[PDB]
Amino acid sequence: MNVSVNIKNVTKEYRIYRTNKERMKDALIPKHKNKTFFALDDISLKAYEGDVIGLVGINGSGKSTLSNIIGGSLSPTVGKVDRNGEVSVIAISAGLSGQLTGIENIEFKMLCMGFKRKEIKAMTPKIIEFSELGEFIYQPVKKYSSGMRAKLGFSINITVNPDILVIDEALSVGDQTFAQKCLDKIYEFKEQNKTIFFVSHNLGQVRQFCTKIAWIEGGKLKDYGELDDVLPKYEAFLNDFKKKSKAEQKEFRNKLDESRFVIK
Amino acid sequence: MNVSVNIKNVTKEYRIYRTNKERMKDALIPKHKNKTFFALDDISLKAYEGDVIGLVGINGSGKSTLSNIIGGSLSPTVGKVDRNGEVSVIAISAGLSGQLTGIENIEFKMLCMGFKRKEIKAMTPKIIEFSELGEFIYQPVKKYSSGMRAKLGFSINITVNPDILVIDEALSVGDQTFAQKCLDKIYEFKEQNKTIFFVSHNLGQVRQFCTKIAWIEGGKLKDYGELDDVLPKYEAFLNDFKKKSKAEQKEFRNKLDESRFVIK
Amino acid sequence: MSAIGTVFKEHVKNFYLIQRLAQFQVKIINHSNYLGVAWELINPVMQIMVYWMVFGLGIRSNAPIHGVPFVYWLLVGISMWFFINQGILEGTKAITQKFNQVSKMNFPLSIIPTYIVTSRFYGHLGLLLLVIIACMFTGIYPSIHIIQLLIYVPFCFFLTASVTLLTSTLGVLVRDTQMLMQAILRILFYFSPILWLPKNHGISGLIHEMMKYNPVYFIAESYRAAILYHEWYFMDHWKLMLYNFGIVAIFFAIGAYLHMKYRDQFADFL
Amino acid sequence: MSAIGTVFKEHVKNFYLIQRLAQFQVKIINHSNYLGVAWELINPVMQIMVYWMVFGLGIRSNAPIHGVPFVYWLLVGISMWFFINQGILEGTKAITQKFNQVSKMNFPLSIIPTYIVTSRFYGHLGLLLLVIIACMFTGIYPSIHIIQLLIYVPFCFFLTASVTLLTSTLGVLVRDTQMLMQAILRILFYFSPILWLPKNHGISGLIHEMMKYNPVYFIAESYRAAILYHEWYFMDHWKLMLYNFGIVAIFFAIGAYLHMKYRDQFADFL
Ligand SMILES: CCCCCCCCCCC(CCCCCCCCCC)(CO[C@@H]1O[C@H](CO)[C@@H](O[C@H]2O[C@H](CO)[C@@H](O)[C@H](O)[C@H]2O)[C@H](O)[C@H]1O)CO[C@@H]1O[C@H](CO)[C@@H](O[C@H]2O[C@H](CO)[C@@H](O)[C@H](O)[C@H]2O)[C@H](O)[C@H]1O
Ligand SMILES: CCCCCCCCCCC(CCCCCCCCCC)(CO[C@@H]1O[C@H](CO)[C@@H](O[C@H]2O[C@H](CO)[C@@H](O)[C@H](O)[C@H]2O)[C@H](O)[C@H]1O)CO[C@@H]1O[C@H](CO)[C@@H](O[C@H]2O[C@H](CO)[C@@H](O)[C@H](O)[C@H]2O)[C@H](O)[C@H]1O
Ligand SMILES: CCCCCCCCCCC(CCCCCCCCCC)(CO[C@@H]1O[C@H](CO)[C@@H](O[C@H]2O[C@H](CO)[C@@H](O)[C@H](O)[C@H]2O)[C@H](O)[C@H]1O)CO[C@@H]1O[C@H](CO)[C@@H](O[C@H]2O[C@H](CO)[C@@H](O)[C@H](O)[C@H]2O)[C@H](O)[C@H]1O
Ligand SMILES: Nc1ncnc2c1ncn2[C@@H]1O[C@H](COP(=O)(O)OP(=O)(O)OP(O)(O)=S)[C@@H](O)[C@H]1O
Ligand SMILES: Nc1ncnc2c1ncn2[C@@H]1O[C@H](COP(=O)(O)OP(=O)(O)OP(O)(O)=S)[C@@H](O)[C@H]1O
Ligand SMILES: [Mg+2]
Ligand SMILES: [Mg+2]
């Protein structure tokens, strides 16, 4: 009943250049007209506490732009985001250095997330136990496999305790023997009534995890509502798209991209 | 009936150090004894023409090491790989530069794969048409979304014509509307009777794509044979692993890692 | 005025964070070396040997300066240079290559060039300790005048940090700014008292008078007076110290305002 | 002997590939600049102004050398330096940051430091053209002696490429080697005829005689004789040219052997 995230009329615009001469004229002339791309265009949705919201849409729709705007990394060109509570983003690799050993990466990434010295010293061993790396935790991260690096990054990233959580493209990580622990940890995050924003193309995890769907189409919020109301319509759009010809799909893509570009 | 890839007794060993003092003693002393890790241990399998071989196993098994040894990037410590034919690896991002525009990346990546000037000028437009990037093909790659970068990298990477193909972790790329074209292109690669090595954890794509399974467990070839013979046993191992306790799983991991480490 | 208090408070509750991230950066840039983090000591010493072979033997034939042999005179003067040059060079681009790894975390963004500077300040402190120990081997022993280093070494750190705080924000807004620093640092190097004194060579009314506006002139002269000459440097050069403090305050003020104005938009310029 | 033929053949069937990858590298390192790829021209010119302010006005008060004013004398001498320094610095680490992007492709691995060197050779050619045009504005016009540049500029490119081919392989095997290059290049810079001539200043029997073993001395002197002095440089300095050709051949031979021995194992050292 209490609003945790309030997005009001958020627009993200990017100036589009082909040469350095165009970039320099836009910088130096106060009323220069240039091509502008709308990554987002007047997004208005409000999130309550305990809402698990899935961000669906085709490639280049603007869901990572909206997720970065919610997470605070990116500023809106226009509009405001009001967040009641702390925001954490689960991105496994942002603090991981190949040069540092796995034990060193846990402290460096944890320091960069804002944990204190006593907290890092307290919860390093269960991060080591969760990662299941064994003897390679004293080895440099550039010597890891991709699944080992993903497991270590997820084990560091899962220890946050925010009010608003943002997850991008991965509920789970690793092989089949490791994914269930990740699902249990994410479901434990869901169990303590936190606002979770999920950005993925895996519609099975979206259906089994989320409670609300925000459909983004061409920089705009196409639909927002309950999962059983909005997700069948996105699935119907997805099956309707494959039954068109190549000319019809190109016409749809061109009509989508026509409104997103403007000279101003 | 003709052997395309012949792997005979391939072993990959890595020296393991904790301090710089140990690394310096190993470098400077002719008979220094040190901890050695077996990434691979006496691998012997031979591939015929038209074989589609799936490399399965848990994280850190050594399947990327075997795939890089087959692809020529990594040298065996012991043993020999004999390849009849050219080898190409589908890794989408290896030549992609954020600073370069998508049109510039296609030429730079294609030059680095070894294509000639007339070939690059000939097949640039169908790469642009396959990528479906639209107006963003003249924009820098650092301004792309992750799906757009993946689509461009796949569109450049799919144009090779080898005798032996190595695919790592991705048959498809992009959203649901783009994955079917990737599946059609990979199946077209399968249709011209090429030896394909597939490394993935997605067992559905492995079952629907591969004809032979190479199971790697702890740096060793656990089983090699037909898909219907070997893949149910790997699936049985996978379901047997989740029904153990945490102590039993730790004991299995420790027993696996005990044989892989040796002082020599 | 709120920008000054904001940057100051983000620097004072994150002192341990700055030190630990600087130690991690030192370990990161020296990871594949066989000698490890000793190269932060070895490479300035080799450059010192090159500069003494050129500017000591080739120019003045290793003649003493002010009753001190030239090797120790140059050794005290060049000790802070490598830190200043490396900190200004690396921390101008610090937000350019370090913003994206801390963008999604709640991080104090103004301390990134400060820990990049502190990663070179560690090697500066080690080199200064070796320089004092090497000066002990001739007959120049630490007197009571060496406690001025407790003022002068933090001043060198704060000058480098303020210049770096301004130039990191300017580098994100205009990348061309990082290209300017190569010529700017050579201007700061050669127009200084570190390799020569233009009193026994040429014109003092123009070359030596304009060298006073360089902060490097004060830092090299102050270390030499603290370590070699055994004099209180602030009795005769208090106006120069006040000018240098004003330069540091102006750099900190302009850098703190620019960072607070563009910090939300950094993803846009990157 | 097979290593020489292998590296030579990989360089001669990939000439267009080297040129196009060098152009792409030039566009990559100058992408976020407002001025674009003009900084490869602008930054050496600013450094030239700094070096003329210091070593021309401060040292010799802009006195002419050999009937030529000092600005054009320094301008012809320092033209190849920035290319040599930048190519040796960047291409020592070229396989360290460029092997992984071409490891899974069938690529000629010996041309990676060569295109890294050629990316600086483009700016060297532009700077040399501007230097000749600037020398036209005084009264020094191109005579028949300027066709020696067709020998001397490729010699500078081949020296940089051979040294870079050796030092790139050594940098992958020992990372410490890249740390050595900072002192080595300052030795090559200051012990040369680019900023000064030790004939009217100090000792010629030791300083000037040992400067002949530097390849930089031949390259600066040869460009000056081709451009400024209007003389055939190989009539009086053929032994120095033979010594420099032997140095280039020795560097190419040792670099080509080491690269062929470790190229399969590069993933191990990286
Ligand atoms: C050798 C090379 C030579 C060429 C160099 C030319 C470069 C000049 C660049 C100018 C620059 C650098 C600061 C200058 C240096 C610091 C000065 C002190 C230095 C002393 C040592 C200053 O731009 C500043 O931008 C501020 C914006 O808040 C603005 O504030 C006030 O402005 C108005 C009232 O004037 C008032 O309306 C506003 O509300 C105020 O807030 C400042 O007045 C303005 O100076 C940055 O330009 C900025 O770039 C931004 C992102 O690309 C861009 O925003 C984006 O918006 C969309 C995305 O979100 C999207 O559409 C575009 O991506 C882009 O539009 C800004 O529009 C642009 O301006
Ligand atoms: C300031 C810092 C000071 C400290 C610096 C100390 C650094 C010294 C390092 C020594 C070094 C650099 C070359 C030296 C520079 C070039 C010289 C010329 C320079 C002139 C300008 C030369 O090592 C060379 O290795 C060759 C290996 O083929 C070897 O060849 C012959 O050797 C035998 C007959 O002698 C004969 O048995 C062999 O068959 C021959 O082929 C050469 O004789 C040997 O010199 C490299 O060390 C190598 O590193 C390799 C990968 O880490 C390592 O292989 C790995 O194998 C497994 C993985 O696959 C795994 O187990 C390990 O990962 C590692 O074991 C090698 O074992 C090691 O040796
Ligand atoms: C890779 C290493 C190689 C190095 C390359 C070689 C280059 C070296 C340059 C040398 C230099 C640079 C000064 C440094 C400036 C620093 C500030 C710059 C700052 C700008 C940011 C140092 O020369 C110095 O300057 C004075 C010049 O003599 C001299 O001063 C004295 O003057 C008082 C009388 O006037 C005297 O009574 C008193 O004792 C001092 O006060 C100093 O003692 C002398 O050391 C310039 O001096 C040049 O060199 C010679 C010096 O001898 C000189 O030649 C000749 O001099 C005598 C006939 O005239 C003859 O007897 C010499 O035999 C012969 O040599 C040149 O004509 C001169 O132009
Ligand atoms: N800095 C930028 N400048 C210009 N366009 C940008 C920039 N960053 C992103 N875009 C464009 O913004 C659009 C949407 O961005 P994203 O949010 O990353 O896409 P997306 O909806 O997440 O789609 P995905 O990641 O492939 S599922 C795309 O067309 C991008 O090319
Ligand atoms: N340079 C290296 N030095 C030491 N160990 C290494 C090195 N490269 C890889 N390894 C180890 O070799 C083992 C197997 O490597 P990989 O082939 O990448 O693993 P993997 O079988 O592909 O498992 P994945 O990628 O998580 S499904 C792992 O334990 C790695 O840590
Ligand atoms: Mg892998
Ligand atoms: Mg995305």
Numbering used by the authors:
A (entry chain D), B (entry chain B): 1 to 264
C (entry chain C), D (entry chain A): 1 to 270
Text taken from the publication that reported this structure:
Wall teichoic acid (WTA) is a polyol phosphate polymer that covalently decorates peptidoglycan of gram-positive bacteria, including Staphylococcus aureus. Central to WTA biosynthesis is flipping of lipid-linked precursors across the cell membrane by TarGH, a type V ABC transporter. TarGH is a heterotetramer composed of two TarG polytopic transmembrane domains (TMD) and two TarH nucleotide binding domains (NBD). Like other ABC transporters, TarGH uses the energy derived from the ATP hydrolysis cycle in the NBDs to drive substrate transport across the membrane via the TMDs.
The cryo-EM structure of S. aureus TarGH in complex with ATPγS was determined to 2.3 Å resolution. One of the highest resolution ABC transporters yet determined by cryo-EM, the quality of the reconstruction permitted confident modelling of the complete sequences of TarG and TarH. In this ATPγS-bound state, three well-ordered LMNG molecules are observed. Two are bound in symmetrically disposed wedge-shaped clefts formed at the inner leaflet/cytosol interface between the TarH GH, TarG IFc and the LG-loop on the opposing TarG protomer (denoted LMNGC). The third ordered LMNG is observed on the extracellular face of TarG, on the dimer rotation axis (LMNGE). The level of detail at 2.3 Å resolution allowed unambiguous modelling of key active site features that show it to be in a non-optimal configuration for ATP hydrolysis. The aliphatic side chain of Val173 is inserted into a hydrophobic pocket, which includes invariant aromatics Phe154 and Phe178, with its backbone carbonyl flipped away from the active site and no longer in position to coordinate the catalytic water during ATP hydrolysis (we designate this D-loopOFF). An additional consequence of this rearranged D-loopOFF is the creation of a solvent exposed cytoplasmic channel of ~10 Å across at its narrowest that runs through the NBD dimer, continuous with the electropositive intramembrane cavity between the two TarG protomers. We speculate therefore that the LMNGC-bound (D-loopOFF) structure represents a substrate loaded state with the cytoplasmically oriented lipid-linked polymer captured at the inner leaflet of the membrane but prior to polymer insertion and translocation.
